[PDB]
Amino acid sequence: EVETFAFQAEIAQLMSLIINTFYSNKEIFLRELISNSSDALDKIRYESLTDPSKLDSGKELHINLIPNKQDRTLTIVDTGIGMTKADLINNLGTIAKSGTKAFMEALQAGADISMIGQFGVGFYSAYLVAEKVTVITKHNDDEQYAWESSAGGSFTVRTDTGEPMGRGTKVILHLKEDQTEYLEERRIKEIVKKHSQFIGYPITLFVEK
């Protein structure tokens, strides 16, 4: 059973600007998704300081990067706090209406797209490289859900009866045909070293074959 929702107008405008602006420095999407994973991991760690049972759904706090050349997907997995269904619907747990407003004002004043994370809407930088994004998530207080969007003004949410996650978020980037460099080990390693050197959780880059 699949529910289809319209993006709020401002989020549809953000996504269109990300997809249609000429901007070569696309690799920052990975920094932004890793930063979001780090933020989610910090939240479950904080909750666990006063309630150790918060980690009954998984004690390890980590980020995995999983390229798949046959499916043309790059998946970013973390064991952070996850998202409830309500968080997914509410712009993946962001204040994206006010963040988009500020970001578009900053772009008109001379900022560039790489600054998107300063406005709290870095998730949507996935559309620099992905034609479709699927987000699987599990929060301790809710069931496992799949969010998906190919932009175009709408997103879907469904209960996910597939591979159980324990707790956390998996962002599956269905890459554009001309963006397959982000499946190459040496390219991913270079981006993680350049932009994510101070992330305080283990980042494991899986290899293929």
Ligand SMILES: O=C(O)c1cccc2cc[nH]c12
């Ligand atoms: O239920 C599934 O479709 C499924 C797919 C891939 C991996 C796993 C692990 C448990 N269940 C899975």
